[PDB]
Structures are given as structure tokens and as C-alpha cells.
């Protein structure tokens, strides 16, 4: 009998939808209270003389709706690395030396927790997606994680570098196709973000760089995705449908350049306005084929780039104020952790749904949406289905 | 009532992922290997290192490269002397070049793939962009989307700092995108520019010098899709894929992006580690197909350098014809990192047509494509040819 490509294809593919079976999260230990951050930040960057700029930064922090963030960087590391405390001193080598180690380390912490929840042998992991906006190396963070966890050497890896804030959507869009197209496939997904690449001193000339110093936090999240769950596996969410789009008239709204001074952040145009103007079109594309037009009838995960995005989306669509609760909770307790945020928010929604005895992992609702927002301006959409509790 | 199970059955494709187009592009500056030691030691103001230049000449003579294409030229190097230093802060100058040049060269390859495919570019649903040359946000995938005028809703996979195995990685990814999504048409672009790694010579790091003899510039693009239309023209089917880390290979190929640019480090014996492990990779790929004669399949191997090809050929007993397409690309283009195996797939189709052979795979049915790179990572793709 001569084996054909059509035979192989039929035997190779999975049957059912991609299913989230575990979520784990991790943060660096140094907890940074937002209410005292202007005083800490102006002191460690030797900027106490800039009293007007410090006032502007206090207003940014006060408006952020962030209570605390976790940071790998602490006073001791900043004292050892004064190039990082300047506005634009040569500092990429110092920042790389930190993040090429700490990004996979924090990833491993999140991944161990996801694997524990999943309750299967790590030898059954067939695919690894590693996503970061913090540093690059060869071999990559995917290779480093494979060694730290002792995954099979034949794990199929997808190394997603320099992605930015929409990529929590991207990794679920990729994991969906890996799980669905490959019988038995189990996909470990890790997003790990460390602000050591982007931390720098303040200047009046670049108030967009300063906004970043108020919002960005550190964290890592991991999920396990697979089709055709075993009886001993415990589904949390199904991945139903995905999209990625570039918003019209958004050119240069969010740019990030990796330079000898590290990663620099640049803002033009009105990000909250552009996202609000365009979000309904994205929802119709996702939900009109499912017969859904009431956006208060679905559970919400939105990347909290800042509070203004969430406020203007809520106001544009007339969401009840409860829809954004899980999202605002993560923003409040962790800040903007770039690609990892939306995965923290998925965990928080499951946890709150359990605590409050709701019927499903999606706050008692059946259908949900997850949005990533970032450079492009790029919007990632993922349609989700909850599981009954 | 619409169910997720009904959505999944309607959403997915039926047939195997099929390569439907290949296009390639290079920068215009052609650099002859026979004169490269004189050129390189002159534009780096290194003519006084006479013993090192003799070592570099021997490296160029053993490379089995006849020529390379380079974005970098004498004018650009005189404008950017920090790039000509062995180790001077120079990443901003390098980034300024590659963040523009990578998507520009990628566009040139993509336009040619799209021309061969013969369909409207509005039907491209997915874009994979792959480079080892620079990073930016938004990425080269965004820049290429804008340059080509693809649909704003194209689904993008930006594959940065990938290294030399990623020619296999982008096919492994394209396969799942095409096969899981009814109607999906995947544009795949690998674009590599050595402005990120070019640097002056020293005698302390002979591994950095080996890079200066082997690495060239180039971009390649493919269209991948399942369930071809009658008006599409298949070239190859993507059958099966694998990625693995070789045992005892830790630190064999490291590359660090620093203030001096991208630095290349070699430990261990790369040709030896690949040769020692290549039969295990072939057995995993081909024993389920009932194939054990590795002279009966067509070959595409990443030409990391000539020693890798020589030692795999000697270990397996490949006939000298097997590595011909691979050696032809190494000779005419050098090591173009991730793009190199796509140039070789094009070369094999082209020679098959020219010589009137029965299939795009040199008249053979089954084939293997190997990527080799940092890890030490080996990518394996099993290919099926199409009849001519
Ligand atoms: O400059 C940065 C910092 C980066 C980041 C955030 C959090 C973290 O923990 C690590 C890195 O996220 C970004 C995301 C962007 O879309 C644009 C940017 O310019 C940046
Ligand atoms: O430092 C480089 C240069 C890079 C490259 C090659 C060709 C090209 O055209 C552009 C970049 O490829 C690499 C591939 C590696 O596995 C390790 C490396 O260190 C490098």
C-alpha cells in the first residue's frame, strides 16, 4: 500500500475547536505603589529639580487608574546601571543583559503554573509560542524556556519578538490554528514582558515617553491550548473566530524603535478616538454571523492600553459599566503588561466567575470577545465561548 | 442556532498546503568572492593585518561561493565608519538601513510571487514576514502590507531575529494557516540584509570572520494555499514538518543584538553535529512514508557553509547530484540565512523545467527541505513534487 498526501492529511488533523485548558500568571516580586511613584521616579532618575515636569507626571499617574505595578527593576539594579536612569545614555547592552535572562525566567514561572493546572505530563506539549516585546537573542526565549522546563527537544516553537500590545490576541490566533490542524497537539503559549527595555529618565520634550513611565508594568501569562479535550482535561474557553486589522488614518499612532538607548515609545493622533471610532465595525464582523448585536450580552476582555481607550469604547457602544470590570481590575492591580494583559484578564474573569458562583467561566454568559490593541494601529479580535461551571 | 462545532466544520480547508508561487530578489551590488579579501580589507582600512588577510583569503577560497549581493557598498561604508569598525557602537546606523531596506527587498520578491500566482492580491488572507536583520514596531510585516496594498485585515505573523533555520519555520507555519482555513492564501516573505552583521576583521574572533566570507543578502516569497483553483498552478505540496534541538549542541551558534550590531559566535563542530543527527531526522520524516533510500528523494538543505553539505553527503552517501541545486544557490548568492532554502526550491523547479524532467522535484516524487541554525535547531519539511 502506497501512502498518499491526502491519506496523511486526513489522519493528521484534529476534529474540534481549539480549547483553553489552563492559564497561569507571574510577576516580578518588587511591587511599586502608583501613589508614591512620581517621588520615587524623579529621585532615582536625578530629576527632582524638574518640579513642573514632576507635576505633569503626578497628573498622568493620578489619571492612570493604576494602583500598583510589578517591576523587575528596583533601586539596587538602577544604582548598578546609571545609563538606564538617564533620558538617552547608551544603555541597550545593560538592558539586553537583564531581559535575555529575566524574560524566559518569568515565562517559566507562568508556564509551570499553567502546566500544574492542566494536570498532564509536560512531555505531551507539542508546540510552544513565546511572545515578548522585551529584548531579542539567538537562540531565542523559546529555546531558553524549552531548556528551563525540560520540554521535548522536538517541541515545535514559534518565537514572537518585538510584537507590542496587540500580541496577546496574536498568540491565541496562532495557537488556534496549531491546535486545530494537528491531532493530539497541545500548545503552550507564553507572553512575558519586562519594562527594563523601556524605563528611562524624564524630559519636557517627549511627554509621550513620559506617559509610558506611568502605565507599563511587568508580567507573564501562559495558557495551554488544544483540540479534542481528554476526559481528564478541564476546558475553560473555546477559541471560535479571529481577525487582525489596521485602522484607517492611524499611521504612526504608536511607534517603538530599538536603539542604542533601548526601546523608545512614540505617540501621535488620538488612540482612544481611533479605537472607539472603529470598534463597532470589528464587533459586527465578529458577531453578525453569530446573530449577536447586543454587546452587553457578551463577556469583554479588552487590552487596557490606558483608561481613556476603555472609557471611550464603553461610551461609544453604551456598555454597562460592569462589562469592563475584569479589564479595569487588571489595569488597577498590574498596569499595562503589553502582550500578557489580556491573558491576566481571562484568568481574572474565570476567577471572579468561580468566586461569585456564576454559571460559566465568562461571568455567566456564553459568548465573549477579546481585543488586542497596539502598533499599526492594529486591532486583534478573538471570539470566545465560555464553559459551564 | 449557530454552534462552534458547525462553525469549525465550515471554516476549515480540505486539502494539503500547496506552494503555488516562488519569487526572489537581491540588492543590485554584486560582490565577486575572488576579489572580496582585497575589497573587505581595504574598505575596513585593515590592509596592515597581512597574516589575517591570508587567513581570510583561505576562508573565501574554501567557501564555494562565487558571488554575493549586498545592500552595503563603498559609499554607504564611507558614510558609516562605525559599521566598518570590528566593534564600535553602530546599531542605530544599522537599524536606519535595515528597517527600510528589509521590507523594500521583501516587496520586490513578493510582487514576483504574486505575478506568478496570477490571482488578485486582495485574495491574500495571511502574511508571514521573516528576517534576522533589524527589528521595529510596527514590524516589517506592517511595512510590507502598506507597500503591497494588501487588505488592512490581512492576518500577519512577524518572525524577527529568527536565524538560518527559519526558511523551514515559515513553511511549517504556512502549512497550518493554509490547511485550517478555507480559502486562505498565505504570502510568505523572508528578507535578509547583512548590514546588521557586517563588521571589520580581528584575529581574536575567527568565527566572526567566517560570517564575513559566507553571509549574503536576498529575499524570497512563496504563496501557500489548500484546495487550489483550476487557474492556480501547484509547484510542491507540504506534507509533514518537524523542528528539533540537537543533543550536545548548546552554544554551537549564538547571535546577540548589541550596541555594535548583531554578533555571531561559533562553538563546537556544527557540520559534525548536523551530520551525526541527520539520519535520525530522515527516519522520523520518511519511515512512515515507507522511504529509506535518501538518494531516491529530492534535497533542499540550508547551505550554512560548504562543510555542512560535504559532511552530510559523506555521512549518508548522497550521490553528487543530490546537493546540486543547494550548491548552485550557495555559489551564486552565498548564505542568505532564512531566504536560502526558498531560493533553492525555486532553483530546483527552474532546472527541472530547463532539463525537461517529469516533476518540479528533478523528476522525483518526494523531497526533504532542511533548515539549520541556532539551537542547534534543525527544521525538516517533507515535500511532494508536481508533474510537469
Ligand atoms: O516602548 C514600549 C514598551 C513595551 C513594554 C511594555 C511592558 C513591558 O513589561 C515591557 C515592554 O511595550 C510597548 C508597546 C508598544 O505598543 C509600543 C512601545 O513603544 C512599547
Ligand atoms: O549575525 C548573523 C547575521 C545574520 C544574517 C545573515 C544573512 C543576512 O543577509 C542578514 C543577516 O544571520 C545569522 C544567522 C545565525 O544563525 C547567527 C548569526 O549570528 C547571524
Q: How would you portray this structure in words?
A:
Chain B: This is Chalcone synthase 1. Chain B: Its EC number is 2.3.1.74. 2 copies of one chain form a homodimer. Chain A has 389 residues and is of the alpha+beta class. Chain A has a domain at 237-386: 3-Layer(aba) Sandwich (Peroxisomal Thiolase, Chain A, domain 1), CATH 3.40.47.10. Helices cover 39% and strands 22% of the residues of chain A. Chain A has 13 helices and 13 strands. Chain A has helices at residues 5-12, 37-44, 51-63, 75-79, 82-85, 92-118, 141-149, 167-180, 207-215, 271-287, 307-317, 325-334, 341-355; strands spanning 19-26, 31-33, 68-70, 127-132, 156-161, 186-193, 219-226, 237-246, 254-259, 262-267, 299-302, 367-374, 378-386. In chain A, the strands form 3 sheets. In chain A, strands 5-4-6-7-1-8-13-12-11 form a 9-stranded mixed β-sheet, with helices on both faces. In chain A, strands 2-3 form a two-stranded antiparallel ribbon. A two-stranded antiparallel sheet of chain A has the order 9-10. In chain A, a hairpin with a 3-residue loop joins strand 12 (367-374) and strand 13 (378-386). Chains A and B meet through helix 1, helix 6, strand 5, helix 8 and strand 8 of A and helix 1, helix 6, strand 5, helix 8 and strand 8 of B. One naringenin binds at residues 132-133, 163-164, 192-194, 196-197, 215-217, 253, 255, 262, 264, 336-337, 373-374 of chain B.
Strands, helices and their partners?
2 copies of one chain form a homodimer.
Chain A: H1 5-12, E1 19-26, E2 31-33, H2 37-44, H3 51-63, E3 68-70, H4 75-79, H5 82-85, H6 92-118, E4 127-132, H7 141-149, E5 156-161, H8 167-180, E6 186-193, H9 207-215, E7 219-226, E8 237-246, E9 254-259, E10 262-267, H10 271-287, E11 299-302, H11 307-317, H12 325-334, H13 341-355, E12 367-374, E13 378-386
Parallel strand pairs in A: 4-5, 4-6, 11-12
Antiparallel strand pairs in A: 1-7, 1-8, 2-3, 6-7, 8-13, 9-10, 12-13
The complex binds naringenin (2 copies).
Amino acid at each position: 500500500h502506497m501512502v498518499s498526501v491526502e491519506e496523511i492529511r486526513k489522519a493528521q488533523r484534529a476534529e474540534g475547536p481549539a480549547t483553553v485548558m489552563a492559564i497561569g500568571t507571574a510577576t516580578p516580586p518588587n511591587c511599586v505603589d502608583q501613589s508614591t511613584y512620581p517621588d520615587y521616579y524623579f529621585r532615582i532618575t536625578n530629576s527632582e529639580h524638574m518640579t513642573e515636569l514632576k507635576e505633569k507626571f503626578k497628573r498622568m499617574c493620578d489619571k492612570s487608574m493604576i494602583k500598583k505595578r510589578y517591576m523587575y527593576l528596583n533601586e539596587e539594579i538602577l544604582k548598578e546601571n546609571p545609563s538606564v536612569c538617564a533620558y538617552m545614555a547608551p544603555s541597550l547592552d545593560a538592558r539586553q543583559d537583564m531581559v535575555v535572562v529575566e524574560v524566559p525566567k518569568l515565562g517559566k514561572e507562568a508556564a509551570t503554573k499553567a502546566i500544574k493546572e492542566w494536570g498532564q505530563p509536560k512531555s505531551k506539549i507539542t508546540h510552544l509560542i513565546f511572545c515578548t516585546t522585551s529584548g531579542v537573542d539567538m537562540p531565542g526565549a523559546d529555546y531558553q524556556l524549552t531548556k528551563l522546563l525540560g520540554l521535548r527537544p522536538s517541541v515545535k516553537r514559534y518565537m514572537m519578538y518585538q510584537q507590542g500590545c496587540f500580541a496577546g490576541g496574536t498568540v491565541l490566533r496562532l495557537a488556534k490554528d496549531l491546535a486545530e490542524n494537528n491531532k493530539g497537539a497541545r500548545v503552550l503559549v507564553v507572553c512575558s514582558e519586562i519594562t527594563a527595555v523601556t524605563f528611562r529618565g524624564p524630559t519636557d520634550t517627549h511627554l509621550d515617553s513620559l506617559v509610558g513611565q506611568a502605565l507599563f508594568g511587568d508580567g507573564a501569562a501562559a495558557v495551554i491550548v488544544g483540540s479534542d479535550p481528554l476526559p481528564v482535561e478541564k476546558p475553560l474557553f473555546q477559541l471560535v473566530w479571529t481577525a487582525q486589522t489596521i485602522l484607517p488614518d492611524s499611521e504612526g499612532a504608536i511607534d517603538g524603535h530599538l536603539r542604542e538607548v533601548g526601546l523608545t515609545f512614540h505617540l501621535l493622533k488620538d488612540v482612544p478616538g481611533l479605537i472607539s471610532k472603529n470598534i463597532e465595525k470589528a464587533l459586527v464582523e465578529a458577531f453578525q454571523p453569530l446573530g449577536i448585536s447586543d454587546y452587553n450580552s457578551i463577556f469583554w476582555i479588552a487590552h487596557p492600553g490606558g483608561p481613556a481607550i476603555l472609557d471611550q469604547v464603553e461610551a461609544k457602544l453604551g456598555l454597562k459599566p460592569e462589562k469592563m470590570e475584569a479589564t479595569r481590575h487588571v489595569l488597577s492591580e498590574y498596569g499595562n503588561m503589553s502582550s500578557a494583559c489580556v491573558l491576566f484578564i481571562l484568568d481574572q474573569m474565570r476567577k471572579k466567575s468561580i468566586e461569585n458562583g456564576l454559571g460559566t467561566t465568562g461571568e455567566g454568559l456564553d459568548w465573549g470577545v477579546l481585543f488586542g490593541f497596539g502598533p499599526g494601529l492594529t486591532v486583534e479580535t478573538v471570539v470566545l465561548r465560555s464553559v459551564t461551571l
